[PDB]
Each structure stands twice: as C-alpha cells, then as structure tokens.
C-alpha cells in the first residue's frame, strides 16, 4: 500500500488564494503519488462562533470547491469531521499525553484569543489536540499545510513520538509538505500580515469563489513600496507587497523567481500587477465555473459524503481500536 | 421518571461508608428514577497508570456495582469508551466553554486533567440528566454542567436539562478508624478504611486497632464531641444492623469497648459475606459482564445519539449520510 496523506480546512469564511496556494495546490498533484484523505474539518470551525445556517452553507461549498480543484472522489478520500466519531474520541485521549504549556504557547491560539476576545473558548485552546488526532488515525507519512501550521504539526510529531515511546508502533510519526512558493501569502492593503480567509477589510483578500472583475481592482490597488526606479524584485524585508505579487504570480504560472525577475526587466509595478490580474483572473473563471456544476448538485455531494466517511471509518477504527488497547480500555464487543 | 446520572471511577476500592451511605441509599430507588452509572475509563487516563490494571479497574468497578444490588434490567450500567457519543458532545461543550472557566476550577499537567469537567459535563447532559449526586469535591464541576446547559439552550432552544443536585444525603454516617473527626474515604491511611473486598481477619484487626476513648469505667454511650471512637463504632454497627442508637447503648449496658469492637467487626463481616460472595461469581463470568456492558451501551447510546442529533442539528453540522 501507499504512503498516506492527510490534510484539512476549515468551512468558516472564504476561502483564498492564499488557502490554495499554501495547501489545497499540494492536495490536488499528491493524489496519485500518494494514497489521498483530504477533511473538511467542521469540529475545527466551531471553535469561532457560527452562524448555524451559514456553517452547514461553508461545508457544502468547501466540498464543492475541493472538487473544483480537481480533487477526485475516485482517487482521494474526501469526508467531513463530524461524520467520523473517531476523531473525537481520539482527541480526547491524547489531551491526556499533551501538556498544558505546549498548547498555551500556540501562536494561533494567541492570535485568535486577542481577536475574538469575548469567546477564548476551551475549543480554541484544544484546537492542536484535535488535530493532531485527525493526522494520527489514518496513520499519515505526510501533511500538506500552510506556513502557519508548522507548529501545530511539530506538537502532533511529538504527541505520536509520546505515545509510542510508551505503547510501541501504534502511531506513524507525519512529515510536513509545505510548498517553496505560496507557502504564507499575504494581505494585499498589509504585506506584513497574512491573508485571512475572514479578515474585516475585504481588500486585503482574493477569494476564490469571488468576482474575477472585483479581483482585478484589487490587484491594482496592492501597496508596493516607494523604490525610485520602481523595480520588479523579491526581497520581502524590503519589498514586501512587490514579493507577495511575485509569490503569487509565480504558483499560479509555475515560473521561477528568477525568471520572473528576467521577464519584468526593464519594467515597473504596472506590468507586474497586470500579469498577476490576468493570471489569477483567468484561475478563478475556470475554477468558478467547475465549482457551481459541483456545488447546485446535492445528489453528488451527498455521494462524496457518504463513500468518504465509509472510506474514513474503516481506517479510523482499525487506529482507535489499537489505542484503545494499548492504553488499556475493556474492548468495545 | 426522572433521569439520575452517577460517574463510578474505576480505580478506587470502595469501602463500607461508600456502600451502606450512598450506594445502598440507590440501590433501593431504581423503580422510582431511570438510573444511569457511567464507568468512567476515559476520565481516568487524565492520571498516567498501568494499561492493564485499568480494564482490570474496570471490570472490578463492574462486577462490584453489581454485587452491590445495581440491577442492569432496572438500571443502565456501561463502560464510558463504549459510547462514543461522550467524547463528540465533549468536543461540542468545549467551543461553548469559556477558557477561563476551567483554569478558575479550584505547565507539566495534562490537558486531560485541564479539560474533563467538560466531558464531565457532557457526561450529563447526554443523557437528559435531571438529577445528579455529588459531593463537595463536585459541586463547582456540576455547577459548570449547569451554565453550559443554559448557555447553550439560550442560543439554540430546550436542547438539555439543566440538571439539579441530589439533595438528601444517606443518613448513614461513618468515620475513619484512627481519626474519628474525619470521614471515611476510599485515603492514604488504609487502616482507616474497611474495604468491600476484605476478609474477616483482616476486619478484626482493623476494628480492634480503631480508637476509643480513656473513660473510666469504659461506657458506651454516644457523644460525638467527648467520645468520637466509641461513637464512630456504634453509627458503623447501627448502619449494618438497622438498630437504634438508644437500642444499642441498652444493649452494651455495663459492657466494655472490646465487646462493641467484637459485635462491629462480625456485624460488617456479616455485611461483606454476602456481598464478596456476588462480587467473586459476578467477576469470575466473562459472559455475563460482557452480555451487560453490551446491553448497557446499547441503551446509553440510544439516549446518546438522540441528544447528539439535536446538538449537531443546532450548531448545523451537515448530517451523517
Ligand atoms: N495566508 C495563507 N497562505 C498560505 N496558506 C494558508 C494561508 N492561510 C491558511 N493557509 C493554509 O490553508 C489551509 C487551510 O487553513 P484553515 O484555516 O482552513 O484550516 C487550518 O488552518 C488547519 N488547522 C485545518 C486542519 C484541521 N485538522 C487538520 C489536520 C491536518 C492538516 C490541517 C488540518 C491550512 O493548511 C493552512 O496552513
Ligand atoms: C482534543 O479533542 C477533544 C475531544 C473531546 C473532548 C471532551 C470530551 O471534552 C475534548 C477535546
């Protein structure tokens, strides 16, 4: 059998250019190479309040735009969270080999506790347990991820190294597959900070269910910096928004830094942007229109939910069972 | 009937003060509620112990409860791991659960031992809990159970019971051997305690180690304040035997303390023939616990996966294919 991959994203907000480049790119090459299970991590997304209605909506169209991508149903497991109860069952057992300090130090429960400060909630402190759950039970090589994620994977790598240390081989310790481009893509009005797939000023985002014409403007109004000669070159200390827009250009295309900065010689941030327009824009029209096709046909999507959960459980079982033995529960009969 | 939950700890020795105070206070009230007890094996890895001293703990705890009188026609008894259910609702009750709540609840430990009064709320509201009996150690964990509860149900409609305490307390009182001031818990000093498990000997060896008093002439007579000993043995003896403080102090009438010892230690050996004698042959059959951890689960999970459905629905989780 192949090595497996595992990999998640959250139904809450919209998803971006920069959910795609940094894992979503990854999930859609892998799935020959690799035995494939991609998550639509609905336990996850409730750990920022929702609205129970616009929850049920954003499962339903990350499902859809997962298979817009071109993740086959046929080819990868695609499931959501919720349907598989081993998830949460394990999650609760390794709270009990994860500390208290390892989980406070985390950098995103830091920044979503500053931001939503009338909801620090226990979920959103626990959020790397559960986890770290979803990547151990379908016993994962690899886990195609973002840049932001990187600590959250290291905690779920010393979980499993934890547990096997008192237990034997019951866990395979996962390995990050974080891109070389598109790894952390950033907000276009604030290159310092991150993109977010639910940020409060709109301009600093390109979603990828959003209007290509509106993408464009966006695009256009993307602060570079004051550099006189203006110059199409990547140092992100320095040239921060100039660095994103080539970053960006770059994982869409395929083409190289270097080649990047050969083809915009002798130019200025107006062909730059222009070649980021029109690459993103014609992505998004040929990603919209298979989207809409996936996403008005419930019938299938309710197909892909249901072979993908029983596709799931069968190795989400055989772990829990495993678990369950090891750390000495009576055996469910 | 309203619904009575118990979480049963598989790692604990139970003791006569655990059995005659609040175990025999239930095990006659299972026609009047819907008994739920809940072995908690998931609450007790949050503590680091052997793997296979835990399924022994487990079924130990089961054929004990049993051997108690816990009727599983009349009452449902399950393992905690069987249903998964706990474990989901647990999850859920986590994102409505404020972060400060748990740290105000009175680096190195676990996120287990941070984490489980909201699976132990979950625990309750599963089952639509009414009632619940807790000691003081629990009270602030139930009143958790309770905000949550209503917090929830604020959002999203009658989801749970907001459940109540069990007020009334046994009735039976029973003190630690060699300190009679305090009460008899399954302790460090196990000369203080008389386990379930126990032998005569062992019993004989213990009561007559318990303190009295230097009364001179020895009386038995009951005073709670001057002579804690010798009243200790006489609420023991009157809890096993069903006599009266008054009856009892007529009886060992010009009768000295080795007399009382001599009656307390045949007394609850008495009390723990027929008990060990159920738990030995309850314990020994593999089938018959196996065949009630079977059933057991099957009922819990009914009520589980009932509650669990509405909360999904609620929060609008997309529904399982
Ligand atoms: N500005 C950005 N630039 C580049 N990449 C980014 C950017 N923002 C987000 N990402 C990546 O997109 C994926 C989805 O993120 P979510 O917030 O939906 O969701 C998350 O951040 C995960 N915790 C969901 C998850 C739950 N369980 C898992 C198990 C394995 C892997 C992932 C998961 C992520 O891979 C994230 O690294
Ligand atoms: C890490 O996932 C978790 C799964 C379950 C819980 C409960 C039962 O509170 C908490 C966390």
């Not at 973002?146 to 240390?165: P, T, V, Y």
Request: aromatic letters at 8%; charged letters at 25%; proline letters at 4%.
């Amino acid at each position: 059998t192949k090595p497996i991959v595992f990999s998640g994203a959250q139904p809450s907000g919209e998803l971006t250019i920069g959910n795609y480049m940094g894992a979503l790119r990854q999930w859609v090459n892998m799935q020959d190479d690799y035995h494939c299970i991609y998550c639509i991590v609905d336990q996850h997304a409730i750990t920022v309040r929702q609205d129970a209605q616009k929850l049920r909506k954003a499962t339903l169209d990350t499902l859809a735009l997962y298979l817009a991508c071109g993740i086959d149903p046929e080819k990868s497991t695609i499931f959501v969270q919720s349907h598989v109860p081993e998830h949460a069952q394990l999650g609760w057992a390794l709270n009990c080999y994860t500390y208290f300090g390892e989980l406070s130090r985390m950098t995103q429960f830091k920044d979503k506790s500053a931001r939503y400060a009338e909801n620090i909630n226990a979920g959103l402190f626990d959020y790397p347990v559960l986890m770290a759950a979803d990547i151990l039970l379908y016993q994962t090589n690899l886990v195609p991820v973002g840049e932001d994620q990187k600590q959250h994977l290291e905690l779920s790598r010393d979980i499993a190294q934890r547990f096997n240390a008192l237990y034997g081989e019951i866990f395979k310790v996962p390995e990050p597959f974080i891109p070389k481009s598109g790894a952390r893509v950033m907000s276009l009005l604030e290159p310092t900070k991150k993109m977010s797939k639910s940020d409060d000023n709109r301009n600093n985002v390109i979603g990828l269910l959003e209007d290509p014409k509106s993408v464009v403007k966006k695009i256009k109004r993307a602060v570079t910096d004051s550099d006189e000669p203006p110059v199409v070159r990547y140092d992100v200390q320095n040239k921060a928004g100039v660095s994103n827009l080539l970053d960006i250009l770059s994982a869409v295309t395929g083409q190289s830094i270097p080649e990047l900065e050969k083809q915009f010689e002798g130019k200025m941030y107006g062909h730059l942007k222009g070649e980021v327009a029109d690459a993103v824009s014609g992505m998004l029209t040929e990603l919209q229109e298979r989207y809409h096709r996936f996403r008005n046909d419930e019938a299938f999507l309710q197909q892909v939910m249901k072979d993908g959960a029983e596709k799931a459980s069968a190795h989400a079982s055989r772990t829990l069972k495993a678990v369950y033995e090891a750390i000495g529960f009576v055996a469910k009969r």
